[PDB]
Amino acid sequence: MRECISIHVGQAGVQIGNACWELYCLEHGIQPDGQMPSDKTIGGGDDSFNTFFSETGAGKHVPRAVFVDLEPTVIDEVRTGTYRQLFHPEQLITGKEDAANNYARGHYTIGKEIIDLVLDRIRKLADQCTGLQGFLVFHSFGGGTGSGFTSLLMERLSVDYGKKSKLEFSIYPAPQVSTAVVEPYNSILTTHTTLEHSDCAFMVDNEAIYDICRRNLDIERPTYTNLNRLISQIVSSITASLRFDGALNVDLTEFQTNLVPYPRIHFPLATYAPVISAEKAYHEQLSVAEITNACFEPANQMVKCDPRHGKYMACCLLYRGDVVPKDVNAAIATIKTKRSIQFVDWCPTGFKVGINYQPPTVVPGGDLAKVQRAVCMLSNTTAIAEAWARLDHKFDLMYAKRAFVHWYVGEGMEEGEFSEAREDMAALEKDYEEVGVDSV
Template identity: 45%
Template sequence: MNSPSLVATASITSPHRVGCQAGVQIGQACWELYCLEHGIYPDGVPYNDYGDGNLDPFFSETKEGRYVPRTLFVDLEPSVVDEVRHGVYRDLFRPDDLVTHTEDAANNFARGRYSVGQEVVRKVLNRIRKQAEACSGLQGFMFFHSFGGGTGSGFMSLLLEKVMEEFTSPSMLRFAVFPSPRMSTAVVEPYNAVLHASTTMEYDHCVFVFDNEATYNLCINKLHRAIAAIRVKKTVQFVEWCPTGFKLGINSGPPTVVPGGDLAKTNRAVCMLANTTAFREAWARVNLKFDLMYSKRAFVHWYAGEGLEEAELSEARENMAQLERDYEEVDGHDDDLMDNHEF
């Protein structure tokens, strides 16, 4: 990456950690790791023995020689962003890039998109515009949020819409936390997730989805098999235009370890990113919960009271049903066959 990219984080009530905001927390962890990887102290001063690496894609340099992240932290209420303001890395960020409001979205997509979110979106856009103008060659945007909360779903859909209007075809990478049924803290997460996905489909370039429950199940139940076994057993069918199915990359440097973190120092680590039709099962799970609530019109008045028309819920659900059908068409297998597969 030779051109700067702008990283925006939007916090929500995380479906995996009670009382915590996912986007801000992920953003905090990312910038701590970026600083360690690039040889930068928590106040933005580079290490004395730092090499000739290129920091420009993620950091801008001040006249005093400090490095400042090209990022925004956004939340509709201040408590979690205040942890950044007063934390170890408080001197790393510009104060104007920590944007908060006085009211949260209360786990309500409509509140984040149509009411409270409208009061802060212009301020956020102004900060994005200012940071983009400071880039010599803007490559794109990275967003960290989740699907289940009011800010991460509602305000993020509003922000994505405005960013697409403001900038000409920017590349967008999104890192999103997906609702998990056994680790959820808000009953209306299916409403938020379906509404968000329906309104942002046309803006998606690449979305990396984090599902803690799926990750846990993968580690416990699936890691004993390998790629070679998949190929031999023919349990996964590859698309015609990519018969090899896998792309491998090797980084010569060992993983950076965060001091005081949960991961021990190691010389090797493996990461896999997969684009698979199995994701339709996650959507089917959320859609089922949506249907169970919407059949009784449960909590719909919360959304209508914040400016959402009920027809939007029906339209969003139809869009998700079409998405499921698209996955099924590509997959070429029915649900019974999928259940019998070994991955």
């Protein structure tokens, strides 16, 4: 009951999926062969972690997940990697030819060859659920598969599962971490196409994560492994309420009520703390007040933007570990007298708090320090439109010359789809302006 199925699309989605499922296993005490010695109900159960793991009669705990990519070499590393035994071979789906950084090939030319198979595997997972809650979809904006195949998959999921909820973790492109020149095109195309099909989308700016790794973990040039371990901690914070329970636990769906005031305004800003090296964590205990304070520092955002220059329509604090509400309330009282926290005039100004007691874990031999308490803030701020403005500007620069547009037309697309997608982004930006304006 309340199962969530995760779908990992393209290289970014798959590699982040590797990191996330490894972290889940460590948090839950599941070994790489899928055995979970603490779990006394063999082959089934209704425990909180069963929202994310099914069980075989042989004691294996299997991610409710599908990994899909149009080339094989990233999923092959899952097939041969440390956690190969976690997954049934049928959950890992690959084609032979990727989308060549081209939305059109991911959505149409190549993607249409494998979409029916992907949907048949997802159906196989859904059929094992007694009360499917929805989907979590992991993908980049910029790749041909992450943009184009994900939009196709989302459109098909709406047809096959109705209004069943679909949440995204979307990797927003940054020049620092490698990136095709056409990624602004792919980003706008997939954002426009998926907008009506997604209920809530957590954007993750690769530049934000890159900066956090360089600045807080003192890593000179972070790798994908560095970025994805940090990303998995944010994902884990956000899904922890689904996977654990406790008296102070608040379900992600309750936060979602507060975070989405209009269907299209569904892009929360995530901030996480604390991110600290082993050397600095040793002999330093970060208190509740300390980590809370860190959420309001822009350097700790998942997306680069300035909330001081927008307005809030919601603020949610997801705590894990050694945290009691008394310390939370005090920390928030302090924050509210020292920070620029301006809400829109049509929404209440309370912070919604949840506490998950299970403490955070880290991957042994990684760079993140193990801490006793952490927090992820989810806010809905009009400032997140700065991220769309930045992407729309790069789009416009190229599109006014039609640079690279022939690679999409060659695959059957029309310029009409470009201007329609760009107009939808313009209306999105205007939506964010309108909701921040004071009421008459």
